């Protein structure tokens, strides 16, 4: 049975094309649009609403990425509204990632244009089901009350907790977009920046997997997490204030350090919130039982949120009771229960986010992608032999598990590692940094196995070990990273530390070259066996 996604009907008057692939659409009444692919929204007259974001003719062009792996945002136009749809320039690069992974081929529309308007279900690609973005009426009422309280009280803190697959991420995106874009009274009011504390390592937003981050947004989040996996450090639409490497998909390897990371990130938010009023939206892990419940209680005790929002009505009574106790122990903190509106597994989305992060170019749209396979790129050579001033990295620190020194080279090879800047010398205390150096790797023994201190270290970015050369003439690491060369050359060698953790093995990078060669057509690769 055909389901009508878009209520718009085109004719010669309302719907017109323009050179460069752009489109001009004039709706005299309220209309809805479900558009699949990458596009840009710029309204000539009237007000539109997309994913909770309100756009007016004063506002600039907003770039939307809508793969059908996630729910497609619905663009609603009020009466007497003239809008312009623009093709996305950078999107082609992302589509060229289809050459490296079959998963990136299924994401977008099959039409030659970047974006396709989905009038009926027949316009969908074959063997794919399109789901529209939806919000509960209770969600809209709660966000309206939150906006009124935010106008009453400057810089609120909104804690969003819930079970996994409860739709907390969708509610977080609409909450952020409505806090940013919605203006009451004067239409000349500018958009407010919104600061997002992303504390979910397993399913992160604005950060690569295994990373907790603090992000400042002046532009609405209209893209999936893998469409903006890495944001450059700080006038841009989305800038990253600070990151820390959990180096795992779950905090269960070290909960307390996790809490410490949150504290440090919260401190930086305070160093903004003193100067200007900025709402903070906190994204939490989907762990509601066992150690995760204690983690949520500790996060409530640390952050002191203005409100706590549990995203499931039908959640376990022990979890709701523990969260209510954690709220009531501090002060009168309003705890509100919300409905949970709930293909692609989280592990696959995590791998897509990591691949999209590593394919970011070092250099409307924010992010740009490089279609070149990781096997074809010229790698960074990090010198391992010499004085700590001479070496590219100070040493290698293993998180939670101490390999034998002969096994470190095999363990880190072809694996994602974190790059950590040592801001203060107090982080290295208690650890034996190797001195002036087949030569061995510079390995810092970590007998406790705990991560480095968040308040003295920061995360520059993630690297992928292209190879390890332990020859006596030139001991070095070949590695690939999306960090720009200016940032890498700004740091000194004694400030940088490579960190091994429990990131997932980048198995996409191993067969990326094989997929590229197979697509271009129409020896033994390490860690890959082939069926025939």
């Amino acid at each position: 049975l055909l389901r009508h996604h878009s209520s718009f009907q085109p004719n010669n008057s309302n719907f017109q094309r323009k050179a460069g692939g752009r489109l001009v659409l004039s709706t005299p009444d309220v209309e809805r649009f479900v558009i699949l692919g990458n596009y840009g929204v710029k309204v000539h007259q009237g007000e539109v609403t997309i994913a909770g974001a309100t756009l007016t003719p004063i506002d600039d062009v907003q770039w939307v990425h809508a793969p059908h792996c996630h729910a497609l945002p619905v663009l609603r136009t009020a009466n007497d509204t003239v809008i312009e749809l623009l093709p996305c320039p950078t999107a082609q690069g992302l589509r060229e990632l289809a050459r490296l992974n079959p998963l990136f081929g299924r994401l977008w529309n099959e039409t030659s244009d970047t974006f396709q308007i989905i009038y009926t279900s027949a316009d969908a690609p074959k063997r794919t089901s399109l789901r529209e973005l939806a919000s509960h009426p209770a969600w809209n009422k709660k966000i309206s009350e939150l906006l009124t309280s935010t106008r009453r009280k400057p810089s609120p803190i909104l804690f969003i907790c819930g079970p996994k697959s409860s739709g907390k991420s969708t509610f977080g995106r609409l909450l952020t977009n409505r806090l940013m874009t919605d203006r009451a009274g004067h239409k000349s009011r500018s958009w407010k920046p919104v600061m997002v504390l992303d504390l979910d390592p397993g399913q992160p937003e604005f950060s690569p997997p295994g990373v907790v981050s603090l992000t400042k947004l002046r532009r609405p989040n209209l893209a999936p997490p893998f469409c903006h996996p890495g944001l450059s450090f700080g006038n841009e639409g989305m800038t990253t204030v600070r990151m820390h490497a959990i180096a795992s998909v779950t905090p269960a390897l070290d909960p307390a350090h996790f809490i410490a990371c949150a504290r440090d990130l919260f401190a930086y938010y305070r160093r903004s919130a003193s100067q200007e009023n900025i709402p903070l939206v906190v994204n939490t892990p989907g762990w509601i039982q066992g150690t995760g419940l204690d983690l949520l209680a500790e996060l409530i005790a640390v952050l002191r949120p203005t409100e706590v929002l549990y995203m499931s009505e039908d959640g376990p009574e022990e979890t709701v009771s523990a969260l209510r106790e954690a709220c009531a122990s501090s002060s009168t903190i309003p705890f509100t229960m919300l409905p949970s509106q709930p293909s692609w597994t989280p592990a696959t989305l995590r791998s897509m986010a990591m691949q999209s992060y590593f394919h970011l170019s070092p250099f409307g749209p924010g992010c740009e992608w490089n279609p070149t396979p990781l096997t074809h790129l010229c790698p960074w050579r990090v010198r391992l032999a010499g004085r700590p001033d001479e070496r590219g990295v100070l040493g290698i620190v293993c998180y939670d598990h101490q390999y034998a020194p002969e096994l470190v080279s095999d363990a880190i090879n072809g694996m994602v590692m974190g790059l950590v800047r040592i801001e203060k010398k107090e982080a290295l205390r208690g650890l034996a940094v190797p001195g002036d150096t087949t030569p061995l790797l510079p390995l810092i023994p970590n007998p406790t196995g705990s991560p480095l201190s968040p308040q003295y270290t920061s995360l520059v970015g993630l690297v992928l070990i292209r190879g390890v050369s332990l020859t006596a003439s030139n001991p070095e690491l070949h590695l690939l990273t999306p960090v720009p060369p200016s940032v890498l050359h700004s740091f000194r060698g004694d400030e940088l530390v490579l960190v091994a953790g429990k990131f997932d093995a980048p198995t996409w990078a191993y067969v990326e070259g094989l997929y590229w060669k197979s697509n271009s057509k129409a020896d033994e690769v390490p860690w890959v066996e082939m069926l025939h």
Binding site: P373, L374, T375, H376, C378, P379, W380, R381, V382, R383, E390, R391, G392, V393, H401, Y403, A404, L407, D410, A411, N413, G414, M415, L464, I465, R466, G467, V468, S469, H478, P485, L488, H489, R492, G493, K502, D504, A505, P506, T507, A509, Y510, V511, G513, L514, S518, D523, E524, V525, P526, W527, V528, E529, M530, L531, H532
Partner: protein, 189 residues
């Protein structure tokens, strides 16, 4: 089409060398030979620990490494002063992991299956399942029983998994020069 399975070992030669280190008698006395065998077994168990850290290691390899590590800790020094809870606990955790992984792999959620029924379906002796249950819900099994069951379990894993693998016989950071660069697979220098 072509399907890819990703392995913690770089190539099949690494896996076959680790198999030879676990099983010197099948693949192929003096005190030097015994010390060499013990050292190679320790090297292999360390490699399987690295493989489990990387991810994608099969359950049979982990079970073999756990049983060989328990046997090595038994042979190196028995905890006669401590009553052997170190050695017996190593054996009991190896058996718990081995039986739990095998049963969880071969169980079906659709049909209600007893653990002994799954053990019969796999071909696993029920002695290992009873040993797992005794180590979990009762006191630890005795050291002699754990030794005999560990040797039988290692032989069972050899006949189940290991035999079928094959026949038995700013100068710190420099961008690399684009003229000299030849594309290679990930992990090759």
């Amino acid at each position: 089409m072509v399907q890819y399975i990703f392995t913690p070992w770089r190539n099949r030669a690494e896996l076959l060398a680790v198999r030879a280190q676990f099983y010197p008698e099948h693949t192929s006395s003096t005190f030097q030979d015994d010390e060499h065998i013990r050292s190679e077994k320790q090297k292999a168990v360390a490699r399987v620990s690295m493989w489990m850290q990387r991810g994608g290691c099969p359950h049979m390899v982990e079970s073999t490494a756990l049983l060989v590590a328990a046997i090595l800790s038994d042979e190196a020094q028995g905890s006669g002063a401590a009553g052997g809870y170190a050695v017996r606990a190593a054996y009991s955790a190896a058996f718990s992991r081995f039986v739990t992984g095998l049963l969880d792999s071969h169980q079906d959620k659709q049909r209600k299956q007893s653990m002994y029924d799954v053990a019969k379906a796999v071909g696993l002796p029920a002695a290992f399942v009873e040993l797992r249950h005794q180590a979990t819900h009762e006191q630890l099994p005795s050291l002699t029983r754990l030794r005999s069951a560990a040797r039988r379990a290692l032989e069972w894993i050899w006949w189940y998994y290991w035999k079928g693998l094959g026949p038995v016989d700013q100068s710190g950071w420099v961008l690399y020069d684009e003229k000299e660069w030849v594309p290679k697979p990930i992990g090759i220098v």
